[PDB]
Carbonic anhydrase 2
Amino acid sequence: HHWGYGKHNGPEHWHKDFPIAKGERQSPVDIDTHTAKYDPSLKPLSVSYDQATSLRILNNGHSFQVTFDDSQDKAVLKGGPLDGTYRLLQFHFHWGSLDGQGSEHTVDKKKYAAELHLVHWNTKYGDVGKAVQQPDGLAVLGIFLKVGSAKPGLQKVVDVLDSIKTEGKSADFTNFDPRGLLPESLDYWTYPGSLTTPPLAECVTWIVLKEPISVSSEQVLKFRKLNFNGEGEPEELMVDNWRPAQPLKNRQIKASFK
Ligand SMILES: [Zn+2]
């Protein structure tokens, strides 16, 4: 039926409705750290999030997402491997049922407990709908989560999750500052890829940060209490909403760091 992460509608099925699932530049991938190429022509990332305006938090039945006002250049990503200015639209997470799985990207086959995606779109295309049709339309910042110490800047998000437990619930979520989710270092790997959910469009420049952030077990536990289902349907916990690594095919992963 409609796609998801279950036995009968999960990632191994998606190609029937979205044939680009078997394409040449699909995501995520395993990052082989010994095969990644240091590229000294890569610039530092510029993350300018001081003027970010968050709007809403929403359970969309496959993750939860925080949406931002992208009507002007408030929260932007520039530099790195990018040409031009990319506006922050939303962030969302992927996570597991257990601490040893949950990330989409892996590093030398290592899985992390979760993965944070900050999705940005190239302002030269005027709106995000147009941007997803272009090979350089989106830039997604990927950040790994490991279980350890708590991340204080994540707590405002975990404390509102009980109010968006089921599919289609949303809530006002203003004045959230996404800088509190970033690691110390902005060293990164980058490669051309795709959205990791349908429609799996091959429009993404991936920027995956080397340094994970730490979250506590109590914080990740709250993610795992969300539901895939709508209110009044049989309860199905929202866990393991990650798509496995795809073949690299004819691509090179570049590193910003030696
Ligand atoms: Zn994602």
In short: Residues 92, 94, 117, 196 surround zinc ion (CB under 6 Å). The domain at 1-258 is CATH 3.10.200.10 (Carbonic Anhydrase II). Residues 114 and 139 are 19 Å apart (CA to CA). The first strand starts at residue 30 and ends at 31.
